[PDB]
């Protein structure tokens, strides 16, 4: 009952789903897409990995628990609002921000994208919590 | 076969670093020079000078497109025909192919062939069952076609 | 065109209402789904359906479709999906522990 | 023109719907739903050519990936119970 | 729209999808329908997407790569879908329309 | 059929010029139909019997009254007197004041982003509640 | 600075998020939730002093102007409701420390608590209809999970019932927002109030006002929309039930109040006579159910229904004395119903039974609890040194001043019947000889109930302290011109 | 180990093609995305997730530089010393290294080590002779050093 064809087409189909979800996420402010559909299809790529494999194997391949993901994404959205609050502005004012981690020095981005990033992480986490909670119930 | 391609890419990097200009034209010039240099040094590598796998995977892409068009013309002349004429079959075929990548590209090629459809690759990687749409029409000629297909798949992997 | 959308959301409302008033629980959740579809189509219809470009400023058209009702619908869609997933897992739990589907028999 | 292709795809979707209504086994209904989704992707492509907008191609690749994931899920369901196995 | 190739690609993909539908109706077994549906609607949808790709590439000068990745994805994924449904039907002890010489 | 209703509502969203709604609608209807099929195949095999929808006359009268009532309120509301809208500001200031060309997403995260935070909260509560219902079995 | 208005919303929210990380560490769950609830009470008191000193507080969320972004508005009534919510939440949280077992609070209990108080606190301060929708679903989703958590058969069944009803009412609020957007074109309270007052002679506004009555009366149980509430509140455990009875039905009452004092003012005669008859039916249903049952939880449930009917009848008169009376009665009734559910929980803990006919003789073993329940019963009825007197006094006076004799007599007889129900509990349970129970020392959980009782007694004594807040609340409710010139600057 | 690097490069190409901008910044973005994707798909490959060979060849470069400096300090204190003190040696060492590339990088590392010089790697790929400059000083400690060196060479190639 070897699923060699299913596993190999999963291995070559999962990267284009992941690139498609990341491209949906990054192009949200200018074209259709956003954190919602990008998070749902990142979860769909992990769903395809769940369909090709076990439930312990996929958490071995992707070593995340998703409850911390939904908590940290909620933290990103609220912290974007708080960083808006401190500088004599109302909550979620959304000015620009430089990130030099150092990665690609002084990357100037609009802070609505980190709000979208919180949306992204909570959508991925919620969908995966639902699916792998139902899966191992028995 | 990928190590030679990576080695040609990094020799193009060394050529771009040997001058002080960084541009795609210098990358193509350095890639051509590295192609000549790897042609000189074919003895040390083990698999193959890397252009032959590139040309035969281009051959497999063209075989995919051509067998797709031929398969849909065959289905076109089966469906618009009076539909009492077909004769089904399910048959086995032995296999010499070992890795699961060549087995699935053989299966994906032979699915898209006119008159055939895969079901039950065996548990052992030793036989493949397949559903023929027309039994007396394509059962030995298309077996020669799939022998040529798996011959080309064998000579991809040397 | 809005008249046709009104006379089809009315049929979605009538179907949802008829499935909610039934004896089995899965029919009730199907009626919940149809009621959600009717409400979201009603938001889109009452926002307006006059022809223009999709809400994207790259397309430089003279007039655009209204951007507000689409955002309100997308909010309502994700909220309705959360409640629907919860209520489906709840129905699964009640099938597992109680052992019946009859809604009138639930006492 | 484009309206002719929409009529032809609409009648094709009606044909796949006739196969999803009847057909004794479940597998006929599954393949009919798969082809119906792919035909829906074609309808979205042609109506995007009609509306003269490049704003719906993500819908097309989305319909493709959703159709593949749903069909492999239900094909796993017909084979020996679960769609998601338990850990060893 | 003004191109012969774009129009003939769109109409050929549409007609070939309708051929997939009448093959879904007329063929007697699950496996023959798998043949017809798989190959014919795969090539039909790729012809339609190539036509739409070429139309937006010509009369708008906009290179849309999402259509090309859709074509590659559908080509990769619809025959393996037909393979999985056909193996799922065969393992369910389902056989129709006068089985010939076939082995297990 | 509920699945077909969902995918055709997505096709309405395509046809009424709403791309984001179509994308999210397609994915959410596929997940929800998978959850309905989860809920179907674990029905108890006793007292199931697969029986049709029982016809009661009062249910049909109430349902037709509900549908025609909300239809006629929608027609009366849509076709009366009106003030226009406030979306000229959003099509005039999505790029001049915010950083965006999309307008559904800029409404969702910048102009009215205060209520997107709490739908994220609703999804979080839903996932945590599903986990809590499945795992906690004190009886 | 000006973000003080968000501190009732932001403080529990953050808290709920950081309670997700450590489920199995119940001690730190208790410590963080307790400290954050105390900070919530302090921040709500600071907000109430802020709205008392200078005017009504409006905050645009972005830097966007008043029609076009989300605006949060705190007037004096919303600040009073936030402070009352904070006090009830603190008492229910300490009762939750003593009452909820270990297994239920390893599975995210305090997170769901904090999300419920997020939902109610966000619902009392908002300036948009659709944002109010979103806060209703935050509140309702957390209430679904708090109702079902634990997973016995009873709370499974009535979670199915409660969830079904609230899904239907959520869809109805969606279609009401859709109709009103098609008529007006805006979504914030103040600007659509201005637009409705610019075309106030149209019948469709009356139809949509009646639809909002139906939605918000599905939220807070009015006749004939009450039918979900007895079984749904017979299901949950005791501090969850105290949260539900204190908070959930009273935000529908506030939404009716804001709707008919802000939005729909033209053609007032039809809407107010409809509210009057629905309120009379609600009072009659509540007192019939309170008389009928020999079960403690059902008695307190139908007292919730009766007090909601009295508040709606106070809303149905557009006089400032009736509005003042229903604000006083609203605050004390939130506090009092939370108190009475905590009493019922302590008595059930002692007796291992909920039937009044099963046990007697609790004064001989639990004197402090007995006389505390006696004072709680007399304060529920409306005896003048206690809390709920000046509210129904002003309601009765405003109904007599508008020539409604029969309805005022209905209010007074309802007060009599609710006194009879709670004193039936006291006289059959506490008095008599000892037969029903076994001596068991209670501990700890009696003290939040005593804290609520002391605050209710001090509320009844000190009306002159707590009145000028209610006077500014009345001055902004019967004049929405100050509301719409505060927001639309 | 090179196939994964080539696969990451072509996935960065697919990322640059999925948009319409061609620049090195988008190439680095696509390379990071492909690094994450290949971290997800580590199960299908056979050798190793490819960052560990990159870090250990950086380790071998640093070992080359450090042993060069230590060797020249050792020769500095041998030559300026009164030259009657050194004790020569030639000794064998067994070898588990199979391919000639790891054998010659072992030989080029152990030539440049303080106090050692290679002569006569055997005809069999099984033993290696070596000339020690100081016999009693470095004959068992430096043997532990070369055991650590060939251990690091073994964990380069997994
Ligand atoms: C900086 C200055 C230029 C450095 C690079 C010069 C060219 C090195 C490669 C030429 C060469 O002989 O290639 C292989 C040796 O590989 C090797 O020696 C390993 C790769 C060396 C990369 C050096 C740059 C990093 C032969 O292949 P082979 O047969 O030895 O290997 C078995 C694989 N089938
Ligand atoms: C076409 C659209 C539908 C596609 C999916 C349809 C097939 C799966 C439906 C459920 C089958 C019946 C079922 O409940 O099977 C149980 C497993 O279900 C489960 O495990 C339920 C979860 C199934 C998740 C499937 C996800 C499909 C794709 C979702 C959209 C794309 C991804 C978006 C993120 C086995 O029952 P049992 O007796 O074993 O008991 C459970 C403990 N083992
Ligand atoms: C706010 C107050 C936070 C600090 C007090 C609560 C945590 C007390 C210590 C618990 C602890 O160490 O939890 C670890 C993570 O902590 C945490 O994650 C707690 C800190 C949360 C920070 C939130 C922002 C990031 C995981 O605990 P474990 O490995 O011992 O678990 C084994 C059985 N669960
Ligand atoms: C100058 C102006 C002052 C303004 C004040 C305004 C505020 C007034 C609020 C009054 C609140 C009273 C609260 C009830 C009393 C609690 C008593 C707890 C201890 C207790 O039960 O003592 C019993 C004796 O006291 C008793 O029996 C006494 C309590 C019973 C009478 C309660 C009368 C309430 C009248 C209505 C409200 C006014 C013991 O009795 P035991 O025999 O079981 O001994 C068992 C041996 N430990
Ligand atoms: C507001 C209502 C406050 C009412 C007055 C305070 C009630 C408790 C008085 C002290 C009684 C003994 C407390 C013992 C103790 O450590 O209790 C802890 C709870 O903290 C507490 O009970 C202290 C809570 C303080 C809340 C008010 C803070 C204001 C600043 C843990 O409880 P446990 O382990 O004793 O019980 C679980 C048995 N299953
Ligand atoms: C083991 C221990 C057992 C203990 C058991 C106890 C059981 C109950 C026994 C009776 C308790 C009696 C409590 C008496 C409280 C006296 C009043 C509090 C002082 C105070 O500032 O009162 C007013 C404001 O209070 C307020 O506004 C506060 C209430 C409002 C809270 C908000 C939520 C409702 C101001 O009154 P004033 O001096 O201005 O007016 C009078 C003429 N001007
Ligand atoms: C154009 C659209 C994107 C096409 C590329 C998508 C990603 C393909 C590679 C992902 C993947 O699974 O890689 C390997 C499969 O390789 C393969 O399937 C062969 C290479 C595929 C290259 C495709 C582009 C030309 C896994 O490796 P493996 O384990 O299967 O192979 C043993 C080697 N250690
Ligand atoms: K809805
Ligand atoms: K919908």
Numbering used by the authors:
A (entry chain B): 3 to 140
B (entry chain E), H (entry chain e): 1 to 158
C (entry chain C): 1 to 107
D (entry chain F): 2 to 89
E (entry chain G): 8 to 111
F (entry chain A): 678 to 816
G (entry chain D): 1 to 489
Article sentences:
The Na+/H+ antiporters are widely distributed secondary active transporters that use the proton motive force to efflux intracellular sodium ions. Mrp antiporters are unique as they usually consist of seven subunits (MrpABCDEFG) encoded in a single operon. Because of the operon’s distinctive properties, Mrp antiporters have been classified in a separate category, cation:proton antiporter-3 (CPA3), in the transporter classification system. The largest two Mrp subunits, MrpA and MrpD, are homologous to each other, have 14 conserved trans-membrane (TM) helices, and are thought to participate in proton translocation.
The thinness of the dimer interface is mainly due to the two very short N-terminal TMHs of MrpE, of only about 15 residues each, which form the bulk of the interface, resulting in only ~20 Å total protein span across the membrane. A very thin hydrophobic belt is clearly unfavourable for membrane protein folding and so it must have a functional role in Mrp, most likely by acting to significantly disturb and thin a lipid membrane in this area. Our cryo-EM maps revealed strong cation density (stronger than waters) both in DDM and LMNG samples. On the basis of these considerations and according to the analysis of cavities and tunnels by MOLE we propose that the Na+ pathway (which applies also to K+) starts near H42g/H131e, passes by the highly conserved D35f, traverses the large Na+ cavity between MrpF and MrpAC, passes by the key E706a and enters the double cavity where at least two cations, as we observe, can be coordinated between E706a, H37c, H40c and E137d.
